[PDB]
Amino acid sequence: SPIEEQATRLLKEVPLIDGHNDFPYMIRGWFRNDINGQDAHLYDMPIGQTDLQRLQKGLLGGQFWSAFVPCPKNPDKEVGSLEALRQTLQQLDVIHRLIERHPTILQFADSAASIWSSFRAGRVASLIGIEGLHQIADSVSALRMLHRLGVRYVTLTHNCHNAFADAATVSPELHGGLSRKGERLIRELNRMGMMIDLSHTSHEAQTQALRLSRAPVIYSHSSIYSLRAHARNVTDENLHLLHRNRGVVMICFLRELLASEADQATLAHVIDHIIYAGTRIGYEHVGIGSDFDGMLRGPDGLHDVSCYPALVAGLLERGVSEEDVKRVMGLNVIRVLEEVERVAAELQGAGEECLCDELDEVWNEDIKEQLTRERERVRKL
Amino acid sequence: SPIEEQATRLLKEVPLIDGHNDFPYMIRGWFRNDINGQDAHLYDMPIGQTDLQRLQKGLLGGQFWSAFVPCPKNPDKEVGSLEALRQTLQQLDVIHRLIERHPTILQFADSAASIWSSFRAGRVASLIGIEGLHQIADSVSALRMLHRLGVRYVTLTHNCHNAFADAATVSPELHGGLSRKGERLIRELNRMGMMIDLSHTSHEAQTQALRLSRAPVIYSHSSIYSLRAHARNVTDENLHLLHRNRGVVMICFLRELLASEADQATLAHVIDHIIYAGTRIGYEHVGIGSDFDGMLRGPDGLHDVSCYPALVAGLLERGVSEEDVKRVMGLNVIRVLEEVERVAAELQGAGEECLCDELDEVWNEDIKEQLTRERERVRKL
Ligand SMILES: [Cl-]
Ligand SMILES: [Cl-]
Ligand SMILES: [Co+2]
Ligand SMILES: [Co+2]
Ligand SMILES: [Co+2]
Ligand SMILES: [Co+2]
């Protein structure tokens, strides 16, 4: 088919960069992060919507691999929070090991330049994002170390309220948007060059984050509210504030977010959602955020990661121009990551002060007096 | 003085690389890891044995900055262990921020090549080590992420027994050396290219680690047992096994480890300890491991980080050859780090399997059956 040829050509010209895939958590469920001698299974998985053979088949250019861990449910609240931090390092560890053991398919990327160089080599550009600020255990230091480990976006919440922001699916509201800590964290995320992700966050938390952020943000996996009313979807108000923010809404393949009846959801609905956003806020602010392996079943026509060429062909069939399809595929999310890193470079270049942790006093006054007396003794010499 | 001129020349030819300095924990005690607008104090500290002015004055070429956190003392044992992991990320964060905010003085290094390039630029080569396996919270995944954050050695214990090995100063013995986990961790540390540090570990744990390790190890800050009998010092038996291992004993400035009467300890004693080891196991297996800022007061003549030229001159005055002084200064610890990285490269190159964490089952059989049924439905299409 000529349109299938056109879609294949576009997929080779520019990388289709998917906003969210939970294949690392599927590895934790199935293999329990032990992938030694599991290559036959990693290429041909007995479960899920992602494996390395189907990943090649769909001609995907890049991927933000989710380092999701569940919201803490332990009665001991400090233990649950600290457990999430240890589990986060396990998920970052298995993502890095997945990339390093399969260098011909996957190549790690943390920037616009690293995405392109990965794509030129014929590799899937493998980026990392964490799904919720519960994962950092209330530690801004830990968050900066997650950035150093290769994390390039942070979803502000998952399906639980935290110290910083409100989740969409939890009632009642705790903060009614962002907290005072949350507002201060927006500045720190902009300063360090961490891309803000507004999926899973409440409508009010989106509105506040979109006005406050000095860098463009993303929705790593969210759909349109006007087409399908859901707490997880993006309202017209927040779509306009995303336009001002210069951000990108990466459209989700979750069936509950595309249609009221789940079994009726399709590839055509995903394209309706992409076209709606592209029509109203322009095609430079729309992306693709599948949430593959964050669901049991996908829409009809988008059952797994091999189905991306059908989406590219489907967009072209509707009359979306090649240039606008390339934008939706990956150029938009590359631009946001590029602008996030430029905003960080200019804020760091202007000597903006970093957000410190709230640390307890480890020494009493007796320890400090011994230390100051000792220093002055050395000054006398 | 001609010998002072000779010492100054040697300090400019090769980097004096100190094995252990606890200045990052002093920043946590004094500033509480908030160094914003504290440059006047960071250059001229009101306490302690390390600041950025005195660091320049002593002509130090490199430094393994300690990311030490205390052994957990909480009644809730899981919380204490998980707390140590969060505190470790705070200490790694402040070390990286200390280096990044002072690029003219400090430059981060994680290899032999990066140490040299830092030294050629006129910077103190800033490496990182953690003081105890309590810091990883029983997670080998976390340990691999600490390596990715820039940690290049791990002290197996501090002053507490852990799951892997026995500390020197705690009785009774738990494992009587290394545990079965510890033995398995030695292989993993060799595979990843993490330098093993045997300071603070029991005599039996040293003996076992020295026989088992495929890469050379270090004592980041330990002294000689025959000159001064202490649990923390290295016995003749372990000095010989260190020679076979090809490791380096980095001599400590702790007064309790140099003499029975603490106030009688001196620079001359440190040189006696260096010469003892250099005479018996050769000068290619001896180093300098001050433990500055891990003590209130230092020996007479080694009161702070500005006193390194006195040590270099003192070694030359005793009749230690220029070539052997250069070895003790830094060439030996560079060689160990170089060999540790080569052993890792050859073990990784031979496809040796990594040590995985013990992970719990997150899915029941009902979840797994839904996933396998769902996959087979997609295969039918
Ligand atoms: Cl380009
Ligand atoms: Cl050289
Ligand atoms: Co997810
Ligand atoms: Co999600
Ligand atoms: Co220490
Ligand atoms: Co110590």
From Swiss-Prot, chains A, B:
UniProt: Zn(2+) binding residues: 20, 22, 131
Cysteine disulfide links: 71-160
Pathway annotation from the record: Mycotoxin biosynthesis
GO terms under biological process: gliotoxin biosynthetic process; mycotoxin biosynthetic process; proteolysis; symbiont-mediated suppression of host immune response
Reaction(s) the record says it catalyses: an L-aminoacyl-L-amino acid + H2O = 2 an L-alpha-amino acid
Protein keywords: Dipeptidase, Disulfide bond, Hydrolase, Metal-binding, Metalloprotease, Protease, Virulence, Zinc
InterPro entries: Metal_Hydrolase, Pept_M19
Needed co-factor(s): Zn(2+)
Pfam families hit by this protein: Peptidase_M19
Domain of life: Eukaryota
GO molecular function terms listed in the Swiss-Prot or TrEMBL record: metal ion binding; metallodipeptidase activity
EC number: 3.4.13.19
SUPFAM superfamilies hit by this protein: Metallo-dependent hydrolases
Binding site for substrate: 158, 232, 291
Function: Dipeptidase; part of the gene cluster that mediates the biosynthesis of gliotoxin, a member of the epipolythiodioxopiperazine (ETP) class of toxins characterized by a disulfide bridged cyclic dipeptide. The first step in gliotoxin biosynthesis is the condensation of serine and phenylalanine to form the cyclo-L-phenylalanyl-L-serine diketopiperazine (DKP) by the NRPS gliP. GliP is also able to produce the DKP cyclo-L-tryptophanyl-L-serine, suggesting that the substrate specificity of the first adenylation (A) domain in gliP is sufficiently relaxed to accommodate both L-Phe and L-Trp.
Family stated for the protein in its record: Belongs to the metallo-dependent hydrolases superfamily. Peptidase M19 family.
Protein name: Dipeptidase gliJ
Species of the source: Aspergillus fumigatus (strain ATCC MYA-4609 / CBS 101355 / FGSC A1100 / Af293)
